[model samples]
Target: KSSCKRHPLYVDFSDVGWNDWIVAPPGYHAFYCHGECPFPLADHLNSTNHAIVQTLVNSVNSKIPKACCVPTELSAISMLYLDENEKVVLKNYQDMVVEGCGCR
Candidate 1:
């Protein structure tokens, strides 16, 4: 039996390295990047992407007309993906916007 614990598929850009990368804990896989994680990338992108997605629900509600918009908010969180019930190892949580929805 495996004694490894499953970690949430959340990557802290400032806390990953080759040493940590080598260990694939239970449900985790390997996610390679150019050299770093999304946290650092978000810092670099802050200027260009002044607008950020605060909540997943807001993004959804914003798509509707003002008359039909109801403010049901939820924090912007990573939507994990899996091929065999195990988390995917990727540099960015969401490939579409490494830091979720960002605007210029």
Candidate 2:
């Protein structure tokens, strides 16, 4: 059976000892975090995760004309450049992070 739950993607920003890049969805380019995102105990996120969110924000901001915001929902139609297989990887990535962080 298929599930219909919507999960939010996040990364931890504390104690980023190494550079790890996680491919993000459309409008959310993967980048290295450099103190751009703040750490909050309530919201579990990381360096790569912060970088992803920062890139997403940058894309949405007017500073970048070619950038766009990544959709919260993961779907084939939402991203024209992404294929079905890629979407599945993204879902898996989100699930792994959510589970690793023990977030709902």
Candidate 3:
């Protein structure tokens, strides 16, 4: 449980009713962000100053909780969907993909 990186995740429009409106992509890489934020994060972890101090603070104080290794950065994906008026709409969906994972 010490890993924090990109993992495989996806959504199938065909399985859901979105396939009726979504005309372009049926599935895409969504990716997952997981793992634990260990005390004293490394450079590759790309931890923040707040998390750095929290790591040490929690060590000293048992009540204060530490940070987590989770999806810190999210990206949008453009989708082509059919509108109720029989028109095609292409728009960027927010937070659809996991771009980066870090201690936060």
Candidate 4:
């Protein structure tokens, strides 16, 4: 069964871009937003163990136009921890602080 549930408080702020986006942890295969989604916002959302996965799928699908978020990568996921603060600071994993690179 799917344990996905949509909370009324869960605001769809896709219009504001990533300020409304969040990256969940691993273990979610089908349709679910696992782990802590943007901290307090996703605090109510639990994995399939707690709720249905379809709810999450619907949420993401609903906010596509504004958030510009996609979940087509069904099989490209790995064991990665989603850190909102870190992600905000470092947009990409390869983005590193070099000594004297002229890519700025």
TM-score of each: 0.15, 0.16, 0.81, 0.13
lDDT of 3 by residue, 1-104 (tens): 56566789877888766888899888788888777777769887788999889988989996988777778789888999988899999998999888888988
Q: What order do candidates take by lDDT, descending? A: 3, 2, 1, 4
24: Cα error in model 4, Å = 3.6
In candidate 2, which residue pairs clash?
11-45, 11-46, 12-45, 12-46, 12-47, 13-45, 13-46
lDDT of 4 at 56: 46
Q: Could you tally the backbone clashes for each prediction?
A: 0, 7, 0, 5
Model 1: per-residue Cα lDDT at residue 27: 30
Model 1 quality (TM-score):
0.15
lDDT tens readout by residue for model 2, 35-99:
12222212333224544455556556847332122222222212123344543233333312212
Every candidate's CA RMSD: 16.5, 18.0, 2.0, 19.1
Per-residue lDDT of candidate 4, residues 5-104 (tens digit): 3212232224334333344231222332322232112333322322234444446675522111112122333323336466532233331111111100
Best by TM-score: 3
Q: What's the distance in Å from true for residue 93, model 4?
A: 22
For residues 49-97, what per-residue lDDT tens digits would candidate 1 score against the true structure?
Answer: 2233322333477662211111112133343334343445533333322
Cα lDDT, all candidates: 0.29, 0.30, 0.83, 0.28
- Model 1 misplacement above 4 A: 1-66, 72-74, 83-87, 90-104
What is the TM-score (0 to 1) of candidate 4? 0.13
